């Protein structure tokens, strides 16, 4: 599959927003919850990568964040998480460089003004004792770095929509 | 009196489907976060009376996933009511595996309100 171009699938987000008519508490509450899930998950993934390196856990973690991101229309984040699941199941053996991924953005102008590598993190990984699982681990770290960037972009757009930094 | 169990590992998804169900007119919704937890909520109502009219269950979940969960509920308990699999992997291959595992229907994620409605009509 090709990563979606748009940061937010409004068809989905509008649907959620249409269910929070009484008080905007429903949809914005979901978003806030998501933001927090995302930061918690990125941190847990990072920990696995630098330690236990359990691919099943990384798969579960990708599955978890894909649920909330997709249900809220943050389709680029959800796409990356599905790559992390497939990487974790050793079903894939490649993950697009960051530049190629940013080039698919429908509005490229959302990127200038920011360093896209600002949140990147290296993976503490045994390069010598590189067993056949190293590739999956390195590929999931690459995708985690992409995810941190997509999360960043999603917060930019969600923040301009709600007129308030989230 | 319709009673439904939603089994998903993410609270956000639980809140969304529960809201879509409330808007369809269903108020008695129960939640579980994994397969084991769902098995217990079900083993329990198999001791009372008011059992679930339907179960919506994530195919993938930690501890006990959806397929193993379904298997236990079907075998160990004698639950014969509808179980709907929730997953984003919706190839024909994926869907058949869910049915082969004892799940009656499927909804793709992110679940869409009309699809939910369509599922309620045929299984509820």
Domain boundaries, chain A: 1-166
d(CA A63, nearest CA chain B) in Å: 8
d(CA A122, nearest CA chain B) in Å: 27
Please name the method used to determine this structure: X-ray
Q: Which of B21, B17, B20, B19 is nearest to B2 (CA)?
A: B21
| CB within 8 Å: A71 and B111 | yes
Residue B114, sorted as left (phi over 0), alpha (psi -120 to 50) or beta, turns out to be: alpha
Residue among A15, A19, A64 whose CB faces B10 most closely: A64
> A-side interface with B, Cβ within 8 Å?
12, 15-16, 19, 26, 30, 33-34, 37, 59-60, 63-64, 66-68, 70-73, 78, 82
Q: Which of A24, A48, A63 is the best mutation test for B, with the most CBs of B within 10 A?
A: A63
Q: Which of B83, B61, B89, B81 is nearest to B70 (CA)?
A: B83
d(CA A115, nearest CA chain B) in Å: 30
Q: Which of A86, A101, A102 is nearest to A135 (CA)?
A: A86
As a whole number of angstroms, the distance between CA A51 and CA A11 comes to 39
As a whole number of angstroms, the distance between CA B21 and CA B87 comes to 18
Give residue A157's Cα distance to chain centre. 15
Please tell me the CATH code under which domain B1-124 is placed.
3.40.50.2300
Is domain A1-166 in CATH 1.20.120.160, yes or no?
yes
Chain A residue nearest residue B64, CA to CA: A60
Resolution (A): 2.3
Query: Which residues, at least 6 apart from A115, have a Cβ–Cβ distance to it below 8 Å?
Result: none
Residues in A touching B9 (Cβ below 8 Å): 60, 63-64, 67
Chain A residue nearest residue B63, CA to CA: A60
| CB within 8 Å: A19 and B11 | no
Q: Which of B6, B9, B10, B88 is the best mutation test for A, with the most CBs of A within 10 A?
A: B10
Q: How many CB pairs under 8 A join A and B?
A: 51
Q: Are B65 and B35 in contact (CB under 8 A)?
A: yes
Cis omega before residue A135 (within 30°)? no
As a whole number of angstroms, the distance between CA A72 and CA A34 comes to 9
Q: Are strands B3-7 and B54-58 parallel, antiparallel or unpaired?
A: parallel
């Amino acid at each position: 599959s090709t990563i979606p171009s748009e940061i937010i699938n409004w068809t989905i987000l509008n649907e959620i927003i249409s269910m929070d008519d009484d008080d905007s508490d429903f949809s914005k509450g979901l978003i806030i919850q998501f933001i927090d899930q995302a930061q918690t998950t990125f941190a847990q993934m990072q920990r696995q990568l630098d330690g236990e390196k359990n691919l099943t856990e990384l798969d579960n973690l990708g599955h978890f964040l894909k649920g909330s991101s997709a249900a809220l229309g943050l389709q680029r984040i959800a796409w990356v998480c599905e790559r992390i699941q497939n990487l974790g199941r050793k079903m894939e053996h490649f993950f697009p460089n960051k530049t190629e991924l940013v080039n698919t953005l429908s509005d490229k102008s959302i990127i200038n003004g920011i360093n896209i590598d600002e949140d990147d993190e290296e993976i503490k990984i045994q390069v010598d004792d590189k067993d056949e699982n190293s590739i999956y681990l390195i590929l999931i770290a690459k995708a985690l770095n992409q995810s941190r960037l997509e999360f960043k972009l999603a917060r930019i757009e969600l923040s301009k929509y709600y007129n308030t930094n989230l | 009196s319709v009673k439904i169990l939603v089994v998903e590992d993410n609270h956000v998804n639980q809140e969304v489907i529960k809201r879509m169900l409330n808007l369809e007119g269903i108020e008695n919704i129960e939640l579980a976060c994994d397969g084991q937890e769902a098995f217990d909520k079900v083993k329990e109502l198999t001791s009372k009376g008011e059992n679930y009219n339907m179960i919506f269950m994530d195919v993938q979940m930690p501890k006990v996933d959806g397929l193993l969960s379904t298997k236990m509920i079907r075998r160990d308990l004698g639950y014969t009511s509808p179980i709907v699999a929730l997953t984003a992997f919706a190839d024909d291959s994926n869907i058949k595996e869910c049915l082969e595992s004892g799940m009656n229907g499927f909804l793709s994620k992110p679940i869409k309100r009309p699809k939910l409605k369509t599922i309620l009509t045929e299984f509820c």
